[PDB]
Amino acid sequence: NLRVLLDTAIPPSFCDTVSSVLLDDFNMVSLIRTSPADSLATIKQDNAEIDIAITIDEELKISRFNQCVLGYTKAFVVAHPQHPLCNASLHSIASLANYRQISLGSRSGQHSNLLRPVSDKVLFVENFDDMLRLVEAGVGWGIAPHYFVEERLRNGTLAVLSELYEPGGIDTKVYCYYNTALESERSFLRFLESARQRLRELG
Amino acid sequence: NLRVLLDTAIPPSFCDTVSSVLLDDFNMVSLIRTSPADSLATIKQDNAEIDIAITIDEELKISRFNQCVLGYTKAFVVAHPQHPLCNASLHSIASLANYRQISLGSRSGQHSNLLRPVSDKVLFVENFDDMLRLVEAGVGWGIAPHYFVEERLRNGTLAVLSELYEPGGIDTKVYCYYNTALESERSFLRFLESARQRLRELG
Numbered sequence: 403n404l405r406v407l408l409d410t411a412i413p414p415s416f417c418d419t420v421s422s423v424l425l426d427d428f429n430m431v432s433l434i435r436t437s438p439a440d441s442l443a444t445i446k447q448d449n450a451e452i453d454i455a456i457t458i459d460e461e462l463k464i465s466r467f468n469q470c471v472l473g474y475t476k477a478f479v480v481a482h483p484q485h486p487l488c489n490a491s492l493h494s495i496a497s498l499a500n501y502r503q504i505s506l507g508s509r510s511g512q513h514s515n516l517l518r519p520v521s522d523k524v525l526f527v528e529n530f531d532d533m534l535r536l537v538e539a540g541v542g543w544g545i546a547p548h549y550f551v552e553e554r555l556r557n558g559t560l561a562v563l564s565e566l567y568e569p570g571g572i573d574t575k576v577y578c579y580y581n582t583a584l585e586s587e588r589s590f591l592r593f594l595e596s597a598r599q600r601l602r603e604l605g
Numbered sequence: 606n607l608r609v610l611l612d613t614a615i616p617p618s619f620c621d622t623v624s625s626v627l628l629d630d631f632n633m634v635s636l637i638r639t640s641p642a643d644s645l646a647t648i649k650q651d652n653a654e655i656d657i658a659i660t661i662d663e664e665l666k667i668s669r670f671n672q673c674v675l676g677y678t679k680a681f682v683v684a685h686p687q688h689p690l691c692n693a694s695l696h697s698i699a700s701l702a703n704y705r706q707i708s709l710g711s712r713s714g715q716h717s718n719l720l721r722p723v724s725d726k727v728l729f730v731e732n733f734d735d736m737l738r739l740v741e742a743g744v745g746w747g748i749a750p751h752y753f754v755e756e757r758l759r760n761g762t763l764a765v766l767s768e769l770y771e772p773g774g775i776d777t778k779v780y781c782y783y784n785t786a787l788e789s790e791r792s793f794l795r796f797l798e799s800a801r802q803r804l805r806e807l808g
Protein backbone atom coordinates (compact mmCIF):
# COMPACT_ATOMS: atom_id res chain seq x y z
CA ASN A 403 0.00 0.00 0.00
CA LEU A 404 1.32 3.32 -1.36
CA ARG A 405 0.23 6.51 0.47
CA VAL A 406 0.86 9.65 -1.56
CA LEU A 407 0.22 13.27 -0.67
CA LEU A 408 -0.76 16.01 -3.12
CA ASP A 409 -1.10 19.57 -2.14
CA THR A 410 -3.98 21.84 -3.02
CA ALA A 411 -1.69 23.84 -5.32
CA ILE A 412 -1.02 20.95 -7.69
CA PRO A 413 -3.34 21.40 -10.65
CA PRO A 414 -5.91 18.69 -10.89
CA SER A 415 -4.73 17.60 -14.29
CA PHE A 416 -1.37 17.01 -12.72
CA CYS A 417 -3.23 15.00 -10.21
CA ASP A 418 -4.84 12.90 -12.84
CA THR A 419 -1.60 12.26 -14.61
CA VAL A 420 0.09 11.37 -11.38
CA SER A 421 -2.98 9.36 -10.37
CA SER A 422 -3.50 7.58 -13.61
CA VAL A 423 0.15 6.77 -14.09
CA LEU A 424 0.42 5.37 -10.61
CA LEU A 425 -2.29 3.01 -11.50
CA ASP A 426 -0.15 1.41 -14.14
CA ASP A 427 2.28 -0.25 -11.72
CA PHE A 428 0.34 0.16 -8.53
CA ASN A 429 -2.47 -1.76 -6.93
CA MET A 430 -3.21 0.08 -3.72
CA VAL A 431 -2.97 3.83 -3.55
CA SER A 432 -4.24 6.29 -1.00
CA LEU A 433 -4.16 9.97 -2.00
CA ILE A 434 -4.18 12.69 0.58
CA ARG A 435 -4.73 16.35 -0.06
CA THR A 436 -2.92 18.82 2.08
CA SER A 437 -2.44 22.59 2.18
CA PRO A 438 0.93 23.33 0.65
CA ALA A 439 1.72 24.93 4.03
CA ASP A 440 1.22 21.51 5.71
CA SER A 441 2.78 19.05 3.28
CA LEU A 442 6.43 18.88 4.46
CA ALA A 443 5.24 19.11 8.05
CA THR A 444 3.11 16.06 7.26
CA ILE A 445 5.70 13.92 5.60
CA LYS A 446 8.03 14.76 8.40
CA GLN A 447 5.84 13.07 10.99
CA ASP A 448 7.21 9.59 11.02
CA ASN A 449 3.92 8.02 11.81
CA ALA A 450 2.01 9.59 8.96
CA GLU A 451 3.70 7.04 6.70
CA ILE A 452 3.66 9.11 3.46
CA ASP A 453 5.61 7.50 0.58
CA ILE A 454 5.28 10.25 -1.98
CA ALA A 455 4.57 13.93 -1.79
CA ILE A 456 3.70 16.19 -4.63
CA THR A 457 4.26 19.82 -3.51
CA ILE A 458 5.24 23.22 -4.48
CA ASP A 459 7.17 23.58 -1.18
CA GLU A 460 11.00 23.29 -0.72
CA GLU A 461 13.34 22.02 1.93
CA LEU A 462 16.44 20.69 0.30
CA LYS A 463 17.42 17.90 2.66
CA ILE A 464 14.68 16.06 4.50
CA SER A 465 15.34 13.34 6.87
CA ARG A 466 14.02 10.29 5.12
CA PHE A 467 13.21 11.56 1.70
CA ASN A 468 14.65 12.57 -1.60
CA GLN A 469 13.42 15.47 -3.57
CA CYS A 470 13.29 15.65 -7.38
CA VAL A 471 11.19 17.67 -9.76
CA LEU A 472 8.04 16.57 -11.62
CA GLY A 473 7.05 19.71 -13.43
CA TYR A 474 6.17 23.35 -13.37
CA THR A 475 2.92 25.24 -12.70
CA LYS A 476 1.82 28.89 -12.27
CA ALA A 477 0.73 31.13 -9.43
CA PHE A 478 -0.65 34.59 -9.74
CA VAL A 479 -0.98 37.32 -7.20
CA VAL A 480 -4.54 38.38 -7.46
CA ALA A 481 -6.77 41.07 -6.12
CA HIS A 482 -10.22 42.42 -6.58
CA PRO A 483 -10.18 44.62 -9.60
CA GLN A 484 -11.06 47.68 -7.55
CA HIS A 485 -8.13 47.21 -5.18
CA PRO A 486 -6.01 50.28 -5.00
CA LEU A 487 -2.86 48.40 -5.95
CA CYS A 488 -4.67 47.13 -8.93
CA ASN A 489 -4.06 48.55 -12.34
CA ALA A 490 -1.04 50.80 -12.01
CA SER A 491 1.39 48.51 -10.29
CA LEU A 492 5.08 49.17 -10.42
CA HIS A 493 5.22 50.89 -7.09
CA SER A 494 2.43 48.51 -6.29
CA ILE A 495 4.86 45.62 -6.71
CA ALA A 496 6.71 47.26 -3.80
CA SER A 497 3.68 48.56 -1.84
CA LEU A 498 2.11 45.21 -1.17
CA ALA A 499 4.40 44.34 1.69
CA ASN A 500 2.06 46.97 3.10
CA TYR A 501 -1.38 45.94 1.97
CA ARG A 502 -3.18 43.08 3.59
CA GLN A 503 -2.12 39.74 2.25
CA ILE A 504 -4.53 36.84 2.58
CA SER A 505 -1.99 34.16 3.20
CA LEU A 506 -2.15 30.43 3.70
CA GLY A 507 -2.09 29.42 7.37
CA SER A 508 -0.02 26.50 8.55
CA ARG A 509 -0.99 24.10 11.26
CA SER A 510 2.68 24.18 12.24
CA GLY A 511 2.38 27.93 12.18
CA GLN A 512 5.75 28.00 10.52
CA HIS A 513 6.35 28.51 6.83
CA SER A 514 9.19 27.89 4.50
CA ASN A 515 10.79 30.93 2.78
CA LEU A 516 8.71 29.94 -0.22
CA LEU A 517 5.39 30.19 1.63
CA ARG A 518 6.02 32.65 4.40
CA PRO A 519 3.93 35.72 3.79
CA VAL A 520 5.51 38.67 2.09
CA SER A 521 3.44 41.23 3.90
CA ASP A 522 2.34 42.20 7.33
CA LYS A 523 -0.39 42.37 8.14
CA VAL A 524 -1.45 39.00 6.93
CA LEU A 525 -4.65 37.27 7.71
CA PHE A 526 -4.22 33.42 7.66
CA VAL A 527 -6.72 31.00 6.13
CA GLU A 528 -6.67 27.27 5.59
CA ASN A 529 -7.20 26.93 1.87
CA PHE A 530 -7.56 28.62 -1.48
CA ASP A 531 -11.35 29.06 -1.69
CA ASP A 532 -11.23 30.62 1.79
CA MET A 533 -8.39 32.80 0.53
CA LEU A 534 -10.28 33.69 -2.60
CA ARG A 535 -13.67 34.59 -1.09
CA LEU A 536 -11.83 37.04 1.11
CA VAL A 537 -9.87 38.47 -1.82
CA GLU A 538 -13.00 38.70 -4.01
CA ALA A 539 -14.71 40.50 -1.09
CA GLY A 540 -12.15 41.72 -1.18
CA VAL A 541 -10.24 42.46 1.96
CA GLY A 542 -6.72 41.64 0.77
CA TRP A 543 -4.60 40.22 -2.10
CA GLY A 544 -3.26 36.67 -2.38
CA ILE A 545 -1.01 34.33 -4.31
CA ALA A 546 -3.08 31.49 -5.82
CA PRO A 547 -2.48 28.57 -8.22
CA HIS A 548 -3.51 29.09 -11.82
CA TYR A 549 -6.36 26.59 -11.83
CA PHE A 550 -8.11 28.10 -8.76
CA VAL A 551 -8.23 31.38 -10.56
CA GLU A 552 -8.49 30.96 -14.29
CA GLU A 553 -12.22 30.88 -14.38
CA ARG A 554 -12.57 33.85 -12.16
CA LEU A 555 -9.96 35.78 -14.00
CA ARG A 556 -11.67 35.84 -17.36
CA ASN A 557 -14.88 37.14 -15.85
CA GLY A 558 -13.08 40.18 -14.43
CA THR A 559 -14.11 39.01 -10.94
CA LEU A 560 -10.34 39.07 -10.22
CA ALA A 561 -7.28 41.05 -11.31
CA VAL A 562 -3.64 40.04 -11.76
CA LEU A 563 -1.27 42.19 -9.81
CA SER A 564 1.58 39.85 -10.46
CA GLU A 565 2.59 40.81 -13.96
CA LEU A 566 5.61 43.05 -13.75
CA TYR A 567 7.35 40.69 -11.47
CA GLU A 568 7.49 37.48 -13.40
CA PRO A 569 5.18 38.34 -16.26
CA GLY A 570 3.17 35.44 -17.56
CA GLY A 571 2.71 34.15 -14.07
CA ILE A 572 4.98 33.14 -11.32
CA ASP A 573 6.75 30.06 -12.27
CA THR A 574 6.74 27.47 -9.57
CA LYS A 575 8.39 24.00 -9.56
CA VAL A 576 6.48 20.89 -8.51
CA TYR A 577 8.62 18.71 -6.32
CA CYS A 578 8.34 15.10 -5.65
CA TYR A 579 9.36 13.89 -2.30
CA TYR A 580 9.71 10.22 -2.09
CA ASN A 581 10.75 7.89 0.68
CA THR A 582 14.27 6.63 -0.01
CA ALA A 583 13.11 3.01 0.07
CA LEU A 584 11.59 3.69 -3.31
CA GLU A 585 14.88 4.77 -4.94
CA SER A 586 15.89 1.35 -6.21
CA GLU A 587 12.26 0.36 -6.97
CA ARG A 588 11.60 0.08 -10.69
CA SER A 589 7.87 0.73 -10.28
CA PHE A 590 8.77 4.19 -8.99
CA LEU A 591 11.40 4.86 -11.55
CA ARG A 592 8.77 3.97 -14.16
CA PHE A 593 6.14 6.18 -12.58
CA LEU A 594 8.39 9.17 -12.49
CA GLU A 595 9.37 8.86 -16.05
CA SER A 596 5.89 8.55 -17.36
CA ALA A 597 4.38 11.30 -15.36
CA ARG A 598 7.16 13.62 -16.27
CA GLN A 599 6.68 12.96 -19.91
CA ARG A 600 2.98 13.41 -19.74
CA LEU A 601 3.33 16.68 -17.94
CA ARG A 602 5.82 18.11 -20.40
CA GLU A 603 3.64 16.87 -23.16
CA LEU A 604 0.65 18.62 -21.75
CA GLY A 605 2.68 21.79 -21.50
CA ASN B 606 25.73 57.07 -14.13
CA LEU B 607 24.12 53.61 -13.84
CA ARG B 608 26.17 50.87 -12.11
CA VAL B 609 24.82 47.39 -12.77
CA LEU B 610 26.03 44.05 -11.50
CA LEU B 611 25.85 40.75 -13.40
CA ASP B 612 26.84 37.51 -11.92
CA THR B 613 29.05 34.91 -13.55
CA ALA B 614 26.05 32.59 -13.89
CA ILE B 615 24.12 34.88 -16.21
CA PRO B 616 24.70 33.61 -19.73
CA PRO B 617 26.65 36.03 -21.83
CA SER B 618 23.88 36.37 -24.35
CA PHE B 619 21.70 37.51 -21.51
CA CYS B 620 24.42 39.93 -20.80
CA ASP B 621 24.39 41.26 -24.29
CA THR B 622 20.66 41.67 -24.31
CA VAL B 623 20.74 43.39 -20.98
CA SER B 624 23.78 45.38 -22.11
CA SER B 625 22.52 46.33 -25.50
CA VAL B 626 19.06 47.23 -24.28
CA LEU B 627 20.46 49.41 -21.56
CA LEU B 628 22.23 51.33 -24.19
CA ASP B 629 18.96 52.40 -25.72
CA ASP B 630 17.95 54.72 -22.88
CA PHE B 631 21.23 54.95 -21.08
CA ASN B 632 24.34 57.01 -21.56
CA MET B 633 26.68 55.92 -18.81
CA VAL B 634 26.79 52.34 -17.68
CA SER B 635 29.31 50.47 -15.60
CA LEU B 636 28.98 46.66 -15.54
CA ILE B 637 30.44 44.62 -12.76
CA ARG B 638 30.82 40.89 -12.71
CA THR B 639 30.47 39.10 -9.45
CA SER B 640 30.34 35.49 -8.25
CA PRO B 641 26.70 34.63 -7.70
CA ALA B 642 27.79 33.91 -4.11
CA ASP B 643 28.84 37.59 -3.75
CA SER B 644 26.13 39.51 -5.58
CA LEU B 645 23.53 40.18 -2.83
CA ALA B 646 26.35 40.71 -0.36
CA THR B 647 27.62 43.36 -2.77
CA ILE B 648 24.42 45.21 -3.39
CA LYS B 649 23.84 45.19 0.30
CA GLN B 650 26.90 47.30 1.00
CA ASP B 651 25.52 50.76 0.90
CA ASN B 652 28.66 52.27 -0.43
CA ALA B 653 29.01 49.97 -3.40
CA GLU B 654 26.27 52.02 -5.05
CA ILE B 655 24.83 49.26 -7.30
CA ASP B 656 21.62 50.27 -9.13
CA ILE B 657 20.82 46.99 -10.80
CA ALA B 658 21.75 43.41 -10.14
CA ILE B 659 21.24 40.50 -12.42
CA THR B 660 21.54 37.28 -10.36
CA ILE B 661 20.42 33.81 -9.90
CA ASP B 662 20.40 34.35 -6.10
CA GLU B 663 17.29 34.98 -3.89
CA GLU B 664 16.48 36.97 -0.81
CA LEU B 665 12.91 38.08 -0.95
CA LYS B 666 13.05 41.40 0.87
CA ILE B 667 16.22 43.44 0.62
CA SER B 668 16.65 46.67 2.31
CA ARG B 669 16.74 49.14 -0.52
CA PHE B 670 15.83 47.07 -3.49
CA ASN B 671 13.02 45.41 -5.32
CA GLN B 672 13.29 42.05 -6.90
CA CYS B 673 11.54 40.99 -10.12
CA VAL B 674 12.31 38.35 -12.67
CA LEU B 675 14.05 38.78 -16.05
CA GLY B 676 14.22 35.26 -17.32
CA TYR B 677 15.23 31.68 -16.86
CA THR B 678 18.50 29.80 -17.46
CA LYS B 679 19.89 26.29 -16.80
CA ALA B 680 22.38 24.71 -14.43
CA PHE B 681 23.64 21.19 -14.58
CA VAL B 682 25.35 19.11 -11.98
CA VAL B 683 28.38 17.80 -13.71
CA ALA B 684 31.14 15.36 -13.06
CA HIS B 685 33.99 13.72 -14.83
CA PRO B 686 32.60 10.89 -16.83
CA GLN B 687 34.57 8.34 -14.84
CA HIS B 688 33.17 9.53 -11.52
CA PRO B 689 31.61 6.72 -9.61
CA LEU B 690 28.30 8.52 -9.28
CA CYS B 691 28.31 8.96 -12.97
CA ASN B 692 26.18 6.82 -15.19
CA ALA B 693 23.87 4.90 -12.90
CA SER B 694 22.48 7.68 -10.79
CA LEU B 695 19.24 7.23 -8.93
CA HIS B 696 20.88 6.35 -5.67
CA SER B 697 23.55 8.67 -6.93
CA ILE B 698 21.05 11.53 -6.76
CA ALA B 699 20.99 10.73 -3.02
CA SER B 700 24.66 9.73 -2.58
CA LEU B 701 26.14 13.04 -3.57
CA ALA B 702 25.51 14.69 -0.24
CA ASN B 703 28.41 12.32 0.40
CA TYR B 704 30.77 12.85 -2.49
CA ARG B 705 32.95 15.88 -2.68
CA GLN B 706 31.16 18.88 -4.05
CA ILE B 707 33.24 21.62 -5.64
CA SER B 708 31.17 24.53 -4.49
CA LEU B 709 31.32 28.25 -5.02
CA GLY B 710 33.02 30.09 -2.15
CA SER B 711 31.63 33.33 -0.82
CA ARG B 712 33.65 36.23 0.42
CA SER B 713 30.96 36.61 3.07
CA GLY B 714 31.42 32.93 3.75
CA GLN B 715 27.69 32.69 4.03
CA HIS B 716 25.38 31.37 1.36
CA SER B 717 21.72 31.61 0.66
CA ASN B 718 19.68 28.36 0.72
CA LEU B 719 19.94 28.50 -3.05
CA LEU B 720 23.74 28.47 -3.09
CA ARG B 721 24.72 26.78 0.12
CA PRO B 722 26.42 23.52 -0.71
CA VAL B 723 24.40 20.36 -0.67
CA SER B 724 27.25 18.17 0.42
CA ASP B 725 29.96 17.95 2.97
CA LYS B 726 32.74 17.80 2.34
CA VAL B 727 32.84 20.72 0.02
CA LEU B 728 35.89 22.39 -1.30
CA PHE B 729 35.26 26.14 -2.03
CA VAL B 730 36.52 27.98 -5.11
CA GLU B 731 35.97 31.48 -6.40
CA ASN B 732 34.58 30.91 -9.86
CA PHE B 733 33.35 28.47 -12.45
CA ASP B 734 36.56 27.75 -14.40
CA ASP B 735 38.26 27.06 -11.06
CA MET B 736 35.32 24.83 -10.21
CA LEU B 737 35.46 23.12 -13.55
CA ARG B 738 39.21 22.39 -13.76
CA LEU B 739 38.85 20.64 -10.44
CA VAL B 740 35.80 18.68 -11.59
CA GLU B 741 37.44 17.75 -14.92
CA ALA B 742 40.48 16.58 -12.90
CA GLY B 743 38.29 15.53 -11.42
CA VAL B 744 38.23 15.67 -7.68
CA GLY B 745 34.54 16.41 -7.13
CA TRP B 746 31.19 17.25 -8.81
CA GLY B 747 29.67 20.71 -9.22
CA ILE B 748 26.62 22.68 -10.27
CA ALA B 749 27.49 24.96 -13.21
CA PRO B 750 25.60 27.27 -15.61
CA HIS B 751 24.75 25.87 -19.00
CA TYR B 752 27.07 28.11 -21.01
CA PHE B 753 30.19 27.25 -18.94
CA VAL B 754 29.61 23.64 -19.75
CA GLU B 755 27.97 23.16 -23.11
CA GLU B 756 31.15 22.99 -25.04
CA ARG B 757 32.74 20.60 -22.67
CA LEU B 758 29.68 18.46 -22.47
CA ARG B 759 29.51 17.51 -26.12
CA ASN B 760 33.12 16.41 -26.13
CA GLY B 761 32.45 13.90 -23.35
CA THR B 762 35.00 15.78 -21.21
CA LEU B 763 32.09 16.13 -18.72
CA ALA B 764 29.02 14.13 -17.67
CA VAL B 765 25.58 15.24 -16.47
CA LEU B 766 24.62 13.76 -13.18
CA SER B 767 21.68 16.06 -12.86
CA GLU B 768 19.14 14.37 -15.07
CA LEU B 769 16.76 12.43 -12.87
CA TYR B 770 16.23 15.37 -10.66
CA GLU B 771 14.96 18.04 -12.95
CA PRO B 772 15.60 16.40 -16.29
CA GLY B 773 16.52 18.78 -19.04
CA GLY B 774 18.56 20.82 -16.65
CA ILE B 775 17.88 22.58 -13.46
CA ASP B 776 15.69 25.46 -14.10
CA THR B 777 16.87 28.60 -12.44
CA LYS B 778 15.23 32.07 -12.42
CA VAL B 779 17.21 35.21 -13.21
CA TYR B 780 16.30 37.97 -10.82
CA CYS B 781 16.65 41.62 -11.23
CA TYR B 782 17.34 43.63 -8.21
CA TYR B 783 16.91 47.26 -8.71
CA ASN B 784 17.24 50.23 -6.42
CA THR B 785 13.76 51.52 -5.55
CA ALA B 786 14.59 54.98 -6.89
CA LEU B 787 14.28 53.43 -10.32
CA GLU B 788 10.68 52.22 -9.81
CA SER B 789 8.96 55.30 -11.17
CA GLU B 790 11.67 55.86 -13.83
CA ARG B 791 10.40 55.23 -17.34
CA SER B 792 13.87 54.46 -18.69
CA PHE B 793 13.95 51.46 -16.36
CA LEU B 794 10.45 50.38 -17.05
CA ARG B 795 11.38 50.47 -20.74
CA PHE B 796 14.58 48.52 -20.20
CA LEU B 797 12.85 45.79 -18.32
CA GLU B 798 10.22 45.32 -20.89
CA SER B 799 12.58 45.10 -23.79
CA ALA B 800 15.05 42.80 -22.21
CA ARG B 801 12.34 40.51 -21.06
CA GLN B 802 10.92 40.28 -24.50
CA ARG B 803 14.24 39.65 -26.08
CA LEU B 804 15.02 36.91 -23.64
CA ARG B 805 11.74 35.11 -24.14
CA GLU B 806 12.18 35.54 -27.82
CA LEU B 807 15.59 33.98 -27.70
CA GLY B 808 14.14 31.09 -25.76
Ligand SMILES: CCCCCCCCCc1nc2cc(Cl)ccc2c(=O)n1N
Pocket residue numbers: 411458475476477479495506516517518520545546547548564567572574
Ligand atom coordinates in the same frame (compact mmCIF):
# COMPACT_ATOMS: atom_id res chain seq x y z
C1 LIG C 1 4.80 40.97 -6.28
C2 LIG C 1 4.88 39.46 -6.33
C3 LIG C 1 5.52 38.91 -5.06
C4 LIG C 1 5.28 37.43 -5.10
C5 LIG C 1 6.61 36.76 -5.32
C6 LIG C 1 6.80 35.74 -4.24
C7 LIG C 1 7.20 34.43 -4.87
C8 LIG C 1 6.02 33.46 -4.79
C9 LIG C 1 6.29 32.31 -3.81
C10 LIG C 1 4.95 31.68 -3.59
N1 LIG C 1 4.54 30.89 -4.57
C11 LIG C 1 3.34 30.29 -4.49
C12 LIG C 1 2.95 29.47 -5.53
C13 LIG C 1 1.70 28.83 -5.50
CL1 LIG C 1 1.19 27.81 -6.84
C14 LIG C 1 0.88 29.04 -4.40
C15 LIG C 1 1.25 29.87 -3.35
C16 LIG C 1 2.49 30.49 -3.40
C17 LIG C 1 2.89 31.33 -2.37
O1 LIG C 1 2.18 31.54 -1.40
N2 LIG C 1 4.13 31.94 -2.44
N3 LIG C 1 4.46 32.66 -1.49
Ligand SMILES: CCCCCCCCCc1nc2cc(Cl)ccc2c(=O)n1N
Pocket residue numbers: 614661678679680682698709719720721723748749750751767770775777
Ligand atom coordinates in the same frame (compact mmCIF):
# COMPACT_ATOMS: atom_id res chain seq x y z
C1 LIG D 1 21.02 16.14 -7.50
C2 LIG D 1 20.84 17.60 -7.85
C3 LIG D 1 20.87 18.47 -6.60
C4 LIG D 1 20.97 19.88 -7.10
C5 LIG D 1 19.66 20.56 -6.78
C6 LIG D 1 19.97 21.81 -6.02
C7 LIG D 1 19.23 22.96 -6.65
C8 LIG D 1 20.23 23.85 -7.40
C9 LIG D 1 20.41 25.22 -6.71
C10 LIG D 1 21.64 25.79 -7.33
N1 LIG D 1 21.46 26.31 -8.54
C11 LIG D 1 22.50 26.83 -9.20
C12 LIG D 1 22.28 27.36 -10.46
C13 LIG D 1 23.34 27.91 -11.20
CL1 LIG D 1 23.05 28.55 -12.81
C14 LIG D 1 24.61 27.91 -10.64
C15 LIG D 1 24.85 27.37 -9.38
C16 LIG D 1 23.79 26.84 -8.66
C17 LIG D 1 24.01 26.28 -7.41
O1 LIG D 1 25.12 26.26 -6.90
N2 LIG D 1 22.94 25.76 -6.71
N3 LIG D 1 23.17 25.30 -5.59
